[PDB]
Amino acid sequence: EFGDLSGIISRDQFYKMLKHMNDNDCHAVGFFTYDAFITAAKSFPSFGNTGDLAMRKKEIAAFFGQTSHETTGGWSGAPDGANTWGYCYKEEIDKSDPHCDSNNLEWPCAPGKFYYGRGPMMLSWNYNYGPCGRDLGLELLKNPDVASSDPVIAFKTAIWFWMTPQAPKPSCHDVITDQWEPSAADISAGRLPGYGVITNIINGGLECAGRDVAKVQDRISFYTRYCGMFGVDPGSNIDCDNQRPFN
């Protein structure tokens, strides 16, 4: 059963965290399931299985904090608070942009396919769908919409993103599990290990260094709620308002 996370996160906890995603007011009702999450996680053994018990729970809280924001349907004064509205969407609302970078040569854009955000991490662009597909043994470049029709695949794309360094960025996994050693240049950029660097990895060019404080605070609000629920310390350097984005 190693790699099965059901011993440290229960259905009760999963659906309490995501208490509105199955509400009629959300847009992917019944799509994201606890079983789909557990199955996806088995494909990435070290996810949720690195460190002591508290570290394992912290990683789960961080992953759900970030993916909850990517998928949020929250608003100011939402029932039970905006930090209860994660997983309200399974794909990007605006589907008009193919997100094709034709200058990349390894991952050709398939005709008529769109690489807009899908899944918990809102995976985007041919240059992410390509290597993700390669790594999962799936044809995601040719069939990107499987990432929004199969919940196991949807979660796998999100965990893949979480586990995968993309130079110069380390993996989110490495940051949250105290396995990332910042370079002297990272230190000069204010990028000290914590949830803040994770926000920076995901969308720092548009949100960090004070560029979108509201979005960053939303990411923090989910994470702190989830940490409180698991009873774990969220760690230091939770914000990224004094970090420079990665280059």
User: What gap in Å lies between CA 92 and CA 143, rounded to an integer?
Assistant: 16
Considering beta carbons, is residue 57 or 169 the nearer one to Cl ion?
Answer: 57
81 forms part of the interface with Cl ion (CB under 5 A): yes
Site for Cl ion in 83-142 (CB under 5 A): 89-91, 113-114
16 forms part of the interface with Cl ion (CB under 5 A): no
Amino acid occupying residue 207: E
Considering the complex, what minimum distance in angstroms separates the CB of residue 145 from Cl ion?
5
CB atoms within 10 A of CB 223: 26
User: Token digits for 246?
Assistant: 């990665």
Considering the complex, what minimum distance in angstroms separates the CB of residue 144 from Cl ion?
5
The residues that bridge with 247 in the sheet, in sequence order, are none
**Cβ distance 246 to 168 under 8 Å?**
yes
Residue 178-217 contact track with Cl ion, rule CB under 5 A, x = bound: --------------x----------------------x--
User: What gap in Å lies between CA 26 and CA 40, rounded to an integer?
Assistant: 23
Considering beta carbons, is residue 207 or 246 the nearer one to Cl ion?
Answer: 207
Amino acid occupying residue 187: I
Considering the complex, what minimum distance in angstroms separates the CB of residue 240 from Cl ion?
13
Please give the distance of CA 168 from its chain centroid, rounded to a whole number: 18
User: Token digits for 163?
Assistant: 């586990």
| Catalytically annotated residues | 70
Considering the complex, what minimum distance in angstroms separates the CB of residue 69 from Cl ion?
6
Binding site for Cl ion (CB under 5 A): 10-11, 24, 27-29, 44-46, 49, 73, 81-82, 89-91, 113-114, 145, 192, 215, 218
